[PDB]
């Protein structure tokens, strides 16, 4: 809440997926890996897998729904991602609805659309700058190769290994 943070990387270290295809990116993605400056590995109580669903609207923004299993319930969080400056980037719709949130950016780093994606998120909340990379899969499992590529990438942004987690597959809520 008050603690020091690993700095957000310059955006020059975060690639953008070439010729992003919004229609192909839609649908359900499972969070198979998660890294960030507020993300901490927890052996005592491991992060559980959650899912994020991207529905492309006629106006070209996404209605985004995250589905999580928390405290024996299904928690649903909804947002609107508005197309940003370059295809594959997004800003947050209705940002004034979010107390303390002054900046929000999504950048799709890499994806093949049918199996995996890596996506960078940065926000400033109460003037503190957070960033996250998610490794998304169309299924709950990915290859060793994709997972190591993701660790390599997360580290290139200055995150140590204790800031890189692999949520445990579950069946509740996310299917
Ligand atoms: N301020 C806290 C409130 O949860 C926080 O951001 O930490 C939560 C953490 N998420 C993030 O740090 C985070 C970073 C950049 C953009 C986002 O949309 C995030 O959600 C997580 O996913 O467990
Ligand atoms: Cl819980
Ligand atoms: Cl493998
Ligand atoms: Cl390390």
Is residue 75 helix, strand or coil?
strand
State which approach was used to obtain the coordinates: X-ray
Residues 6+ apart with CB under 8 A from 3: none
* Nominal resolution (angstroms): 2.3
Nearest to 91 by CA among 100, 101, 80, 99: 80
CATH number at residue 9: 2.40.128.20
- Burial label for 61, CB within 10 Å (0-12, 13-18, 19+), is middle
**CA dihedral in degrees (140, 104, 153, 61; nearest 10)?**
50
The residue contributing the CA closest to ligand 1 atom 7 is 38
What is the distance between the alpha carbons of residues 61 and 132, in angstroms, rounded to a whole number? 21
Identify the residues whose C-beta falls under 6 Å from ligand 1.
36, 38-39, 121-123, 125, 130-132
State in Å: Cα 88 to ligand 4 middle. 29
Beta-carbon contacts of 162 under 8 Å, excluding residues fewer than 6 positions away, are 40, 41
The structural domain count of the chain equals 1
> How many residues are recorded in the chain?
175
DSSP 105-164: EEEEEEE-SSSEEEEEEEEEETTEEEEEEEEEESSS---HHHHHHHHHHHHHTT--GGGE
**C-alpha to C-alpha distance for 134 and 120, rounded to whole angstroms:** 7
Q: Residue 17 belongs to what domain range?
A: 1-175
């Amino acid at each position: 809440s008050t603690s020091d943070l690993i700095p957000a990387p310059p955006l020059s270290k975060v690639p953008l997926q070439q010729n992003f295809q919004d229609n192909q990116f839609q649908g359900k993605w499972y969070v198979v890996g998660l890294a960030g400056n507020a993300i901490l590995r927890e052996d005592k109580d491991p992060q559980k897998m959650y899912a994020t669903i991207y529905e492309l609207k006629e106006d070209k923004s996404y209605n985004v729904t995250s589905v999580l299993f928390r405290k024996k319930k299904c928690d649903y969080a909804i947002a609107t991602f508005v197309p940003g400056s370059q295809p594959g980037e997004f800003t947050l719709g209705n940002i004034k609805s979010y107390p303390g949130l002054t900046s929000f950016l999504v950048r799709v780093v890499s994806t093949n659309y049918n199996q995996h994606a890596m996506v960078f998120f940065k926000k400033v909340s109460q003037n503190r700058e957070y960033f996250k990379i998610t490794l998304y899969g169309r299924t709950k499992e990915l290859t060793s190769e994709l997972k190591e590529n993701f660790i390599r990438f997360s580290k290139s942004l200055g995150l140590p290994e204790n800031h890189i987690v692999f949520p445990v597959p579950i069946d509740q809520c996310i299917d």
